[PDB]
Design a binder for this molecule. Structure first.
Ligand SMILES: [Ca+2]
Ligand SMILES: [Ca+2]
Ligand SMILES: [Ca+2]
Ligand SMILES: [Ca+2]
Ligand SMILES: [Ca+2]
Lengths: 96, 206, 51, 45, 51
């Protein structure tokens, strides 16, 4: 009842029932933790990377990754993933 | 995708595979997925983005044909016919195009001009207040508050709780058009379409 | 160009393709460079049947 | 009767008689596991 | 006294056991037959030109 099947520092029951990170440690989620600023996280207790991105569930939830990653990509279910494209600002047509 | 004029966003959210019993990914609904993806906060369970109201009523959802089939079939067995109550599934493409101007008649007013005779202090509208007073409601939009050669849509929700007389909506933007909206005692939406032109034209009157 | 008018068809036969596969390192760390697919094409086609 | 001759975490008798994966562990196959979503696997031991 | 009797990349045990690439022919499992490819080129159409 305190196993870690995927070895991502978050126990199985926490990933199933909800957890949050306090002092770089995954704690069981109480409903009073909200209104303080804490978010409720859930993840796959058999996957170490639930969203399939380079970062494990703990690195995401803990925020223990690149600090330029958006705050919503700390959720083990939202993937840290860039959408890059090109946009035109002036169009120039020539005869030569 | 969330379009939110002046900035666009694109997200990927993990969805459980229902055929695999050993896929222990947490199950999400479309509303929970949207809240997790864009960091939306819920005021009355209504999922504001920053302060722009985001709901199946406050914005317009756009799917591809495969996602709309999976949503239409799951919309039947659901008691709450809310789209945001359908599960998130794999390969499901959603697009949220927030409106340029919007009023719920309760707390959010984004229009640059005003409507004629509101009559809030009600308790209908799917939430909060609504409109009343058969007298004509119109709005003048200076055509400097819109883009030159775009095609727009105008939507809202309308209820006539005694299956009574019709509503008649006319829009003067490029082709002055008129249509006959017959409400129901429940709430529905109309979504009439118009279009601007002329690069600083006359004005826009709905 | 006249065989093209007689109703013949142009075929694009792929004779070989070069590509990689991904191997996770037990923490979700995929790598693809160095994992060439051609190292398994001969071995798979020999113990298999094509359907 | 619980050897692993090829060292692929699945025992010989399971690969010969049938197995499935439950919680990242190879378990012997019961015929009730189907209708739950589980597939029967066999391999070279 | 030799670990590779035939002088090929594979030891006597890897050959006899078949514990090598599965595209190697069955006779090269014999520690005395060498696993060894004979590659050449063969012509299928001959084209002669003046230009
Ligand atoms: Ca875990
Ligand atoms: Ca996990
Ligand atoms: Ca309202
Ligand atoms: Ca084995
Ligand atoms: Ca020897």
């Amino acid at each position: 009842e305190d196993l870690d099947t995927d070895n991502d520092n978050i126990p199985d029951s926490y990933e199933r029932n909800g957890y949050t990170i306090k002092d770089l440690i995954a704690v069981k989620w109480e409903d009073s933790f909200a209104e303080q600023g804490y978010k409720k996280y859930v993840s796959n207790y058999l996957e170490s990377n639930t969203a399939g991105d380079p970062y494990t569930d703990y690195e995401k939830a803990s925020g223990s990754f690149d600090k330029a990653i958006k705050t919503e990509a700390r959720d083990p279910l939202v993937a840290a993933y860039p959408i890059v494209g090109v946009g035109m600002e002036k169009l120039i047509i020539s005869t030569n | 995708i969330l379009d939110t004029e002046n900035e666009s966003y694109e997200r990927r959210v993990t969805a459980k595979n229902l055929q695999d019993p050993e896929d222990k990914t947490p199950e999400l609904t479309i509303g929970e997925a949207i809240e997790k993806a864009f960091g939306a906060t819920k005021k009355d369970g209504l999922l504001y983005f920053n302060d722009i109201p985001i709901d199946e009523s406050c914005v317009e959802l756009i799917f591809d044909d495969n996602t709309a089939n999976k949503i239409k079939d799951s919309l039947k067995t659901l008691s709450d016919k809310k789209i945001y109550n359908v599960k998130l599934e794999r390969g499901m493409n959603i697009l949220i195009k927030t409106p340029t101007y919007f009023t719920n008649f309760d707390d959010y007013n984004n229009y640059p001009s005003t409507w004629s005779n509101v009559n809030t202090t009600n308790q209908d509208g799917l939430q909060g207040s609504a409109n009343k007073l058969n007298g004509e409601t119109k709005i003048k939009i200076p055509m400097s508050e819109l883009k030159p050669y775009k095609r727009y849509v105008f939507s809202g929700y309308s209820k006539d709780p005694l299956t009574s007389n019709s509503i008649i909506v006319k829009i003067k933007a490029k082709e002055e058009k008129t249509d006959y909206l017959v409400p129901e005692q429940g709430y529905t939406k109309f979504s009439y379409e118009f279009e601007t032109t002329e690069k600083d034209s006359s004005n826009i009157e709905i | 160009l006249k065989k093209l008018d007689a109703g013949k068809q142009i075929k694009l036969e792929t004779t070989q393709v070069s590509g990689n596969f991904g191997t996770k390192n037990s923490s979700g760390q995929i790598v693809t460079e160095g994992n060439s697919w051609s190292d398994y094409i001969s071995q798979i086609d020999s113990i298999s049947a094509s359907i």
